[PDB]
Design an enzyme around this catalytic site. Structure first.
Site, mmCIF file in Angstrom:
data_model
loop_
_atom_site.group_PDB
_atom_site.id
_atom_site.type_symbol
_atom_site.label_atom_id
_atom_site.label_comp_id
_atom_site.label_asym_id
_atom_site.label_seq_id
_atom_site.Cartn_x
_atom_site.Cartn_y
_atom_site.Cartn_z
ATOM 1 N N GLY A 74 0.776 -1.214 0.000
ATOM 2 C CA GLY A 74 0.000 0.000 0.000
ATOM 3 C C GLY A 74 0.814 1.275 0.000
ATOM 4 C CB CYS B 25 -21.567 -13.181 -24.027
ATOM 5 S SG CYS B 25 -21.367 -12.207 -22.523
ATOM 6 C CB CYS C 24 -17.342 -10.640 -24.259
ATOM 7 S SG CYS C 24 -18.994 -10.274 -24.868
ATOM 8 C CB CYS D 210 -23.165 -8.838 -22.319
ATOM 9 S SG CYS D 210 -22.244 -8.764 -23.867
ATOM 10 C CB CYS E 251 -18.396 -8.128 -21.860
ATOM 11 S SG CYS E 251 -19.628 -9.236 -21.157
HETATM 12 ZN ZN LIG Z 1 -20.518 -10.125 -23.115
#
Ligand SMILES: [Zn+2]
Ligand SMILES: Nc1ncnc2c1ncn2[C@@H]1O[C@H](COP(=O)(O)OP(=O)(O)OP(=O)(O)O)[C@@H](O)[C@H]1O
Ligand SMILES: Nc1ncnc2c1ncn2[C@@H]1O[C@H](COP(=O)(O)OP(=O)(O)OP(=O)(O)O)[C@@H](O)[C@H]1O
Ligand SMILES: O=P(O)(O)OC[C@H]1O[C@@H]2OP(=O)(O)O[C@@H]2[C@@H]1O
Ligand SMILES: O=P(O)(O)OC[C@H]1O[C@@H]2OP(=O)(O)O[C@@H]2[C@@H]1O
Ligand SMILES: [Mg+2]
Ligand SMILES: [Mg+2]
Ligand SMILES: [Zn+2]
Ligand SMILES: [Zn+2]
Ligand SMILES: [Zn+2]
Lengths: 250, 278, 353, 353, 278, 248
Positions: free
Chosen positions: E31, E243, E271, E240, E265
């Site tokens: 960090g 897909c 995807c 999406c 996506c």
């Molecule tokens: Zn997709």
């Protein structure tokens, strides 16, 4: 004629915040104290009557002249020559980058003073009159303590012997001895020079010792008015009774 | 005559007219900085564009133009400005203050006293005398408007307290007609007294800052000071090495690395006048 | 003793001749032409047009040649020439919707109506010094796609139709012209945009970069950057009807900026606008970012960076003024210096006493 | 339905080809040579060398040609090339007293030992567009004076001998190198000078102009501006003794600045320093002015302008960083924009409810 | 193989070594922003120089490099970076997160979970999560040092009070190893949960700002939030359009001026993986 | 062991400006008031003992740990979690750009609070306990009056129930009624939560009603010390006699 006449003055940020329908009169040589619960609009009223805040309603006459009907230059001249204004925060009425001597001497030079030595001598004398040492004249107010800064802002706004001085909690941050030394100074100036004072404070003792008349504000409304002794010893409004009862008896 | 292909004095008539109106307003309001729609000149901003514009707007065919920089006619920029005006106007030029009708100057008032019908045009970098105290125009405009010059008096008081003297040595602020605090351009304190009750019109041009201001003839110009710290002009332990004058503003010329120096008149015309008289 | 002599004029003339010879350089090399500078140094020309105030490529290239490539000097030359030109007309307001596009990109959507036209750009190039340019080369043969230009709605028109942003409405207000009157602070947005367009690219880029780094942030997205040819039209008095006088290559940048939540309307994105001559687009982006920063008074924003200080930004933005005043220190200042010296020498004596 | 297709690479290649063709411009005109740019656009080359970090005129001119005249892009090209070069040696400290002068002026004295050499300069020129440059011309024949160079002591050495200024003393402190380690604020004066030399000319010029206008004033005078050829020497390990490797054309600016009154020494002038490659001197003057402004911590000065804010000035001075980060908004940002949109659409639906 | 004339990965060995030391320090101090002497790259600052430097310093001949921008391998800048690395290293490249050994990403964590021995390198504009609250590094360095993150909590509280929500939607601050508040780069809130107890090394490179920081595998990464305002990821009302996934971060593609749009996506590899599986 | 032990503490800007050779002890559940002429160094001493000013001489132990021998992070943690600090100027201990609710809730979140609703409720309750209305929670302190701002800074530094609270003129700008309401609150916290208080004030009545012990400073030197009642009613130093006599 009254030195300062306020008629139906009003200025509200929101319902209950500020002041509304405030009227009173101030003659030379008398002190008009103002008291009330914190946030009652005392500071707003003080700013409005000192040409620092244009009212939404009402009027203010100074020597038969409406305060806000004149040009901005005239009001600036009044605040520069013959009107003192002590602020609740000392630094508001001070120049941080300017020494104490410069802060005091600005007001003297605005009145026509053009002799450096006399300005410095008067600044040293007033620094001593408000209980600050003379060797601090060349020091900036940022190096001063809060009480020292407040007592510098009083000295700055009383060096010119103004006719009318507005104060917001002038005694705040001052010890009792220097407080009484500053009350005696004000009484001397008032009785001798016929100075008029409008003081906002919470310490009722200071108002009793200084204020000739007293006003009580609550929720932006003036509830009680009259002589200081009558108001303090014979209060009528319930809030005034509560405030006097709260006084810490010694 | 003008045979350069430009309009007489290089300015279009609209710009000349606007500057002329500004000049008249400045004359009627002595010490006040009159904004004007200044145009970009063949000289860069900060190299005398305001003075060039004022001269172009006032100059005529019959005028005799004198251009001096640092008090000298032969100074680089003075030569450039004079050549530009000769090209675009064809006016007669002189190095003699007495024979000049128009004088455009950078940082000096001539030693020779000015006379009636003469106009002296100053080139001004900073038309606002309160700028170095308050850099923002939004505040200084109101300070001028409400005659709140308390910041300048405090500055002088603090300068005396810190140093024992007023640090400002040139462009020394002056009150005009009892009202307006004005910057006299970066002339030395030596020259400021010449401004008081002068019989010649004084015009001040800040081209980059877009301001014009003026002092009419026979107008009171009082340098800000204190009674116990009176306005004192620059002084030199030596006279001029060429003419022997003790009353002229002197420039120090370094002759070598060994520290040999000579002080000579900045006002070269006055130096010549004294030297010829012997 | 010493006698004064005249040396200023001949020194000036010799210095100018030296500068001119240096500008010409070695005579064995052919002298540069303004046409070559206009064609091949086109981005410098774009900056010079935008800051000098004239959208004439040939004049800007001429100024660059005369200035020995100095952008500040060329810009000042162009502005000075502008001063000598009569104003023949005021154009009808530009309509960027009619721009014939050379480049149209949007950072807020992957694909938009009309598409992501990269066009001629150095974006995504590997900045490796190309030493083949040390010798003459052959220009590449350009690939050719379909000739039609797809409808390209402004992305901000797509955002405003959804209520996400507000349309920029025209109230008929007369624009302020700082070329005719000196700026008065606070300045109107028209005056601010006019000044920023003339402002120094580096100064405004630094201010915008500071805003991106938290010094008065406005959460910018490049909603659309459009470069192309926009027609200019005027309404001559001799005819009374609009006439198209030609086209100008210009770049328009629209920035989406952090949304606000006004009390009486739905929350919406704010916006900034930039417009420059030619293809150089970073000037337009910096202009949009500084425009949004200077919009603080309209939105009641508490300034957190110098980019939001209107007077500080604008009074020092024009490099004509800034360069002139910085260079003026080269002028003789010995009268003023003698005054400062006269005082300092007295302070030294008094301190020592 | 829709299917994804590959378009990024070919779009990039076509955009690069378009940019290259635009750089070449009309083929009827001969292609510009780097030598021509170096000779005739020498001031742009000077800026590119100074900000890109390499004092190689040919490389800077090549970058300018490759960048289509874009100074920012050319500077970044030169810096990127610098990254690829091995450091072969560290020069012995430059001695500007040995400079062979092309130009030496002082604004504080009318005449000085060695004189006021104007040299090649645009100072005192009438900025009128010279249209004869539209066609080929003949270079002027230069006037010739005596060939000897007069002793030219630094004016600050003349001021310090009188006690008016303090000599800049060398304590042997090792300079900070921000090219090897990132700057740490507050930065040493060596680091500040190194950064300012690499800083944007316009940004620093605007800051200096602001200081002249009261935003952190330092009462500047141009004590001396020196331009000329300074020899570079190195102590190679193979030999152990100094060897002179050549000469560099450089410009040095020394600014006198407002006097101070220290408690324990006589009052004296302060100073600022600027040093650049080539002849462009306004960069050096702005560098000196901003150096003096950033000297505020040493002199305990109360900041009154952004030019005295060290972090703000330096973090945004390098136009490589600033231009890169401003232009990066052109990159696709639709993921981040979708996030901002997803929230706004909800805060629009919760306000309406 | 590398046949470009540059050193393998374009970095000199000294720069690689310095960056490697910085990477090790960052891993040992999760960090914390480790300053490093970053060099100027062939890509402009703000276009992924830090990530390029980190990849160049870590990459080897045997690595399979995946470069994605906005979650897509075909994005302009991702293509440029991948081509540069192919030119100067010759390493194998892939669009499949599963097959990648090194992933350099701008603004997305892949939908496909990462595995052991994978390194994901983030490109970071602003390595300081407190920058937009406090623009000055002089203050944020001390805030990090003294774990004074009170300014961020107040910012979140004020955002909730003003809007009812936390205004930050991407580059959402995360506490790392219970100590260091970190900027996860401008990835959306959707991707932040992937950082928690990940089995892959996460490296963050801010080239322009000259910072490098890292999160080791299996490290606690907790997005700052409130119990009554729990961390909520972006959500869409549509799946999406290609897909049909409802679990992927979606980008809005505008199809016409009439307002027709489709959500697809951003992680194109995911995807494709979903579409092929049907 | 004393909650806070100060030994030979000294810090002077110049001879007579500041404090020198100041030593005392503070146990839980007692209040140590400090009085003196304006500019006596009370504020400097308060800052020095609250880890806000490194002393030139002396030492400060807190729970058997030297205050300035620890790392800056530990002192910051103490000032962030278990130490209240009310400043003479109310705005010093306030965030101007942050609402009153945010100012109060910063201290709560620093202590581990992570529920927005509970933080808001506690802020409203405390705003009411210091006599400010709840509807002002979302308002910035710049819109508040001086007394309102002071009472906001008290609420901010008492919302976390710290063990040790340093105050500089806390009652300044407060009316008598709200002053007594704020003294009663402090007494309740002290008796119930065993809170320790070090208060600098000029109103001797507040010290008498609140301060268990009292210190007197003059020219940066501690001249008198002991119980508040004994010091006020039976002063020994001449300055203490003058100060008590000045009482109105
Ligand atoms: Zn997709
Ligand atoms: N700018 C502002 N916006 C909104 N409300 C304000 C603003 N300034 C003041 N107020 C409110 O107006 C009312 C009047 O405040 P004011 O400062 O006048 O009170 P006061 O009686 O002088 O206070 P005190 O004696 O506690 O110092 C208070 O509620 C204050 O919060
Ligand atoms: N930075 C400084 N430089 C020089 N002197 C200072 C500085 N700060 C404070 N002083 C001086 O130190 C002395 C102590 O001031 P301090 O603020 O501690 O007083 P105090 O007793 O708390 O004041 P009060 O009760 O009037 O508010 C005063 O003379 C003050 O002027
Ligand atoms: O703004 P401009 O163009 O009219 O230039 C006015 C003056 O500004 C510069 O500063 P300076 O007084 O040293 O002399 C120069 C010049 O004469
Ligand atoms: O400083 P660099 O060169 O390493 O660039 C890091 C990041 O800064 C920019 O902002 P971004 O996050 O939108 O994406 C760009 C880039 O990836
Ligand atoms: Mg009040
Ligand atoms: Mg105090
Ligand atoms: Zn003489
Ligand atoms: Zn000057
Ligand atoms: Zn970004």
């Amino acid at each position: 004629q009254p030195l300062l006449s306020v008629n139906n003055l009003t200025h509200l940020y929101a319902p209950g915040k500020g002041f509304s329908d405030v009227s009173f009169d101030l003659w030379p040589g008398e002190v008009l104290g103002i008291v009330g619960e914190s946030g009652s609009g005392k500071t707003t009223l003080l700013k409005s009557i000192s040409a620092r805040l244009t009212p939404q309603q009402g009027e203010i006459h100074y020597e038969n002249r409406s305060l806000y009907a004149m040009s901005e230059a005239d009001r600036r001249r009044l605040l520069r020559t013959e009107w003192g204004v002590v602020h609740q925060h000392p630094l508001d009425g001070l120049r941080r980058q300017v020494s104490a001597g410069g802060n005091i001497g600005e007001r003297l030079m605005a009145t026509g003073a053009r002799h450096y030595g006399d300005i410095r001598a008067t600044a040293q004398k007033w620094l001593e009159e408000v209980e600050i040492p003379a060797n601090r004249i060349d020091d900036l107010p940022t190096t001063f303590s809060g009480g020292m800064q407040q007592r510098l802002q009083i000295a700055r706004n009383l060096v010119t012997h103004p006719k009318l001085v507005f104060m917001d909690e002038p005694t705040g941050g001052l010890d009792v001895s220097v407080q009484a030394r500053l009350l005696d100074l004000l009484r001397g100036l008032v009785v001798e020079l016929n100075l008029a004072v409008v003081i906002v404070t919470h310490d009722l003792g200071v108002a009793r010792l200084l204020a000739d008349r007293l006003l009580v504000m609550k929720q932006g409304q003036v509830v009680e008015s009259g002589l200081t002794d009558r108001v303090l010893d014979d209060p009528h409004h319930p809030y005034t009774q509560l405030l006097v009862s709260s006084v810490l008896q010694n | 005559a003008n045979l350069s292909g430009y309009n007489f004095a290089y300015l279009d008539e609209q710009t000349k007219r606007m500057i002329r109106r500004a000049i008249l307003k400045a004359v009627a309001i002595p010490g006040y900085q009159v904004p004007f729609g200044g145009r970009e000149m063949p000289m860069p901003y900060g190299w005398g564009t305001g003075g060039i514009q004022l001269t172009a707007s006032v100059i005529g065919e019959s005028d005799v133009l004198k251009v001096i920089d640092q008090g000298a006619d032969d100074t680089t920029n003075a030569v450039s400005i004079r050549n530009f005006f000769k090209r675009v106007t064809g006016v007669n030029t002189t190095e003699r203050t007495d024979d000049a009708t128009l004088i455009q100057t950078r940082h000096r008032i001539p030693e020779t006293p000015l006379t009636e019908d003469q106009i002296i045009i100053f080139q001004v970098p900073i038309p606002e005398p309160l700028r170095f105290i308050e850099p923002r125009e939004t505040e200084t405009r109101t300070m001028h408007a409400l005659e709140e010059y308390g910041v300048m008096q405090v500055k002088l008081y603090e300068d005396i307290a810190r140093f024992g003297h007023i640090a400002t040595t040139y462009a020394y602020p002056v009150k005009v007609n009892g009202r307006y605090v004005m910057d006299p351009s970066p002339i030395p304190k030596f020259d400021n007294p010449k401004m008081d009750m002068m019989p010649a019109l004084q015009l001040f041009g800040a081209g980059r800052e877009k301001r014009i201001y003026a002092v009419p003839p026979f107008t009171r110009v009082e340098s800000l000071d204190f009674d116990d710290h009176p306005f004192t002009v620059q002084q030199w332990d030596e006279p001029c090495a060429i003419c022997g004058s003790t009353h002229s503003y002197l420039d120090e010329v370094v002759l070598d690395d060994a520290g040999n120096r000579m002080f000579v008149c900045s006002d070269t015309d006055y130096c010549r006048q004294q030297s010829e008289a012997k | 003793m010493y006698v004064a002599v005249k040396g200023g004029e001949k020194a000036i003339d010799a210095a100018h001749a030296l500068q001119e010879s240096r500008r010409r350089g070695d005579t064995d090399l052919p002298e540069l032409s303004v046409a070559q500078i206009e064609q091949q140094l086109n981005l410098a020309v774009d900056r010079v047009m935008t800051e000098g105030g004239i959208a004439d490529r040939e004049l800007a290239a001429l100024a660059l040649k005369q200035a020995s490539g100095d952008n500040v000097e060329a810009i000042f030359l162009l502005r000075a020439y502008r001063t000598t030109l009569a104003k023949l007309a005021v154009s009808e307001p530009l309509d960027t919707t009619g721009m014939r596009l050379e480049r149209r990109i949007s950072a807020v959507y992957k694909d938009i109506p009309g598409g992501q036209l990269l066009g001629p750009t150095y974006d995504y190039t590997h900045r490796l010094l190309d030493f083949t340019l040390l010798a003459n080369g052959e220009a590449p043969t350009l690939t050719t796609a379909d000739s039609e230009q797809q409808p390209s709605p402004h992305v901000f028109s797509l955002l405003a139709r959804q209520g996400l942003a507000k349309f920029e409405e025209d109230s008929g207000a007369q624009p302020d012209d700082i070329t005719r009157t000196p700026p008065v602070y606070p300045c109107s947005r028209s005056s601010r945009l006019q000044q920023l367009m003339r402002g120094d690219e580096g100064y405004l880029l630094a201010l915008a970069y500071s805003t991106q780094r938290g010094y008065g942030r406005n959460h910018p997205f490049a909603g659309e950057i459009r470069s192309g040819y926009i027609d200019v039209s005027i309404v001559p008095e001799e005819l009374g009807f609009a006439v198209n006088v030609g086209e100008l290559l210009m770049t328009e940048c629209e920035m989406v900026n952090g949304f606000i939540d006004p009390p009486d309307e739905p929350p919406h994105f704010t916006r900034g606008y930039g417009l420059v001559f030619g293809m150089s687009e970073r000037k337009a982006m910096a202009m949009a970012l500084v425009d949004r920063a200077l919009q603080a008074p309209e939105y009641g924003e508490h300034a957190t960076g110098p980019a939001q200080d209107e007077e500080f930004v604008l009074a020092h933005a024009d490099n004509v003024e800034a360069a002139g005043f910085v260079s003026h220190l080269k002028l003789p200042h010995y009268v003023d210096f003698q005054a400062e010296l006269e005082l300092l020498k007295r302070l030294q004596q008094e301190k020592n006493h």
